[PDB]
Amino acid sequence: SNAMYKYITILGAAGQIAQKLTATLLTYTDMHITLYGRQLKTRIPPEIIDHERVTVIEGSFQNPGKLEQAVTNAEVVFVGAMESGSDMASIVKALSRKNIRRVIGVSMAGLSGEFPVALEKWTFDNLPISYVQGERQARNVLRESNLNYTILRLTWLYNDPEKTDYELIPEGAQFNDAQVSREAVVKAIFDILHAADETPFHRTSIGVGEPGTHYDKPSFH
């Protein structure tokens, strides 16, 4: 045990990593969890929504009063999707208003020149430009903030409960891993939330990849 945080607000709560994270925090910590979003009582399963340590708050990133409520007294905010500069700006503004400092957010690997040639080309061949550009703008907004952020740069995702191994790729290092499981990413987030010394995560952007996957594209699964 010994999580470093008790109160977490999860934005993008219906996303797959966010749901897996919520389940692990319920099972393996005594954290109190607030989920913010739209129709969450139907989009998230009842073993989460019915749990006494889960609170749902309705709204979107364009409802500043609701978002501010959701993050009030959060000790850490998890941002499941960093897809839009303006949404990221609204999140940063809400956290700023509530004096919330600690934020962990999910972004994409490949926007800091870190992928090798073939995997980089495959990556951009398989995403719309608008998606890439929105990820870039959201990342820039968060790095420009004064928040104590950790950005997790994820390589290509898949699901496999047997895959929980991850490695962390520092800023500026080659990122050669073509894939990582959502379960491995969730373990990394859990580990960050339990780290007494969080300096490696203080205003840094860290890649998360499956060791041994130096391929030109994610594997067939």
Side-chain angles (χ1 to χ4, degrees):
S1 270
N2 298 321
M4 296 293 144
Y5 297 86
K6 176 179 175 173
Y7 294 96
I8 181 166
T9 297
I10 300 179
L11 310 181
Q16 287 191 68
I17 287 172
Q19 292 198 41
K20 283 178 165 50
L21 174 66
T22 300
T24 88
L25 297 178
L26 292 170
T27 298
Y28 296 109
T29 82
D30 201 42
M31 295 182 66
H32 285 59
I33 305 172
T34 298
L35 305 180
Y36 184 69
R38 177 191 70 252
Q39 292 298 312
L40 294 189
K41 300 178 177 195
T42 73
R43 293 170 68 197
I44 295 180
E47 70 274 15
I48 294 183
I49 295 294
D50 295 358
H51 194 292
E52 63 179 2
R53 279 184 290 120
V54 175
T55 301
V56 171
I57 299 175
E58 177 276 307
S60 80
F61 301 136
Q62 287 76 55
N63 303 133
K66 298 174 180 179
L67 178 57
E68 289 176 40
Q69 176 194 322
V71 303
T72 288
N73 304 316
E75 293 166 350
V76 55
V77 175
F78 180 78
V79 182
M82 293 179 53
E83 286 167 3
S84 155
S86 60
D87 289 348
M88 196 69 250
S90 293
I91 291 166
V92 165
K93 173 185 276 201
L95 273 62
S96 178
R97 287 174 173 218
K98 299 298 183 183
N99 281 71
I100 309 305
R101 310 294 297 138
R102 190 80 181 89
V103 61
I104 297 164
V106 165
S107 185
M108 58 174 287
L111 307 181
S112 299
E114 71 272 48
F115 274 157
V117 170
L119 179 59
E120 184 186 273
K121 180 174 173 296
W122 191 91
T123 292
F124 296 120
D125 285 354
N126 283 274
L127 292 170
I129 291 176
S130 68
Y131 181 83
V132 177
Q133 298 190 333
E135 287 268 333
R136 187 176 287 115
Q137 287 186 320
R139 170 204 72 189
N140 293 347
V141 167
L142 185 55
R143 299 185 310 189
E144 297 161 3
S145 87
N146 52 36
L147 298 171
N148 180 12
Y149 68 83
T150 314
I151 293 166
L152 301 177
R153 293 173 283 120
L154 308 188
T155 187
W156 285 90
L157 296 169
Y158 70 107
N159 297 326
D160 186 343
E162 298 303 307
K163 293 276 191 157
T164 58
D165 189 33
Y166 67 86
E167 57 185 352
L168 299 181
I169 307 295
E171 301 193 37
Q174 300 178 41
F175 193 145
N176 295 135
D177 297 339
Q179 65 192 32
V180 68
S181 77
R182 293 190 178 79
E183 293 91 343
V185 175
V186 168
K187 285 283 180 63
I189 300 158
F190 178 96
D191 290 342
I192 291 168
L193 291 164
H194 287 76
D197 181 359
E198 69 172 21
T199 63
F201 306 116
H202 190 278
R203 298 180 56 80
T204 64
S205 178
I206 303 308
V208 189
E210 178 181 338
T213 61
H214 296 187
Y215 310 139
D216 292 343
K217 68 168 291 304
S219 301
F220 288 105
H221 311 293

